Subunit: 144 residues, 2 copies
């Protein structure tokens, strides 16, 4: 994965400088685990996860079921975070995720800007904004 022309050292992942930013990076590295059970430990009970604008999951159970489901048809092979930053209690990640569909073995590069809200070090909110034109094809589940 190439680092973009527009990448800024000033906001590089290696320069994360808050407890919140550090946890989110750690959550990013954990994604390649494809382990809903390891990942849900990062979330608060009162929480949410959405791939905009698909139906969101509210509550830690729903988030766990949504993740478990994705990891059933899809592997997260790599996460490259170009930018991490934060403002007003929100953390932002500009990044690329490499996704591989399990039934097909086809790989995909999704350019993603995500926002995270954390309360007492745990995720109360997670929204990834990206193009879902291929996400349709990549995730062998109805986008519903």
């Amino acid at each position: 994965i190439e680092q973009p022309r527009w990448a800024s050292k000033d906001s590089a992942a290696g320069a994360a400088s808050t407890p919140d930013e550090k946890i989110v990076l750690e959550f990013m590295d954990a994604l390649t685990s494809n382990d809903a059970a390891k990942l849900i430990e990062y979330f608060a009970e009162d929480t949410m996860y959405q791939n905009m604008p698909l139906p969101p999951a509210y509550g830690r159970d729903a988030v766990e079921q949504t993740l478990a489901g994705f990891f059933t048809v899809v592997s997260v092979d790599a996460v490259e975070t170009f930018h991490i930053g934060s403002s007003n209690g929100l953390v932002y990640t500009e990044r690329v995720d490499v996704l591989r569909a399990l039934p097909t073995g086809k790989s995909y590069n999704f350019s993603i800007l995500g926002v995270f809200q954390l309360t007492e070090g745990k995720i109360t909110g997670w929204r990834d904004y990206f193009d879902l034109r291929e996400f349709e094809e990549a995730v062998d589940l109805p986008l519903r």
Copy 2:
């Protein structure tokens, strides 16, 4: 457009508190002008605009031609900015843009998280992340990606 459940007042548009953040909100407001010539004045010579992951525009001329072309086929009917914030020289807008296709009159609500890099108050980079599944339909031009 209603405020989503996840909207936080701490990061609301009304609470913008840096000159960069305020310039970006001004720029969001101006989008409904549908005027490439007025919008282009917000940009530095060395700039870029991209709707990920479509081919990017680099330089002021390309950005203006791009905007002008969009406004030939789409009106930006409304922009609601739920969140604005900034960090390490970047400004982020969490928002919805209402777009209307001119040939059909159909409307579309796009949920967008966008990043802006400003140098001396001018836009040196602008990247919007959102679902393009309907952007294809909405926009009566070939997408190039």
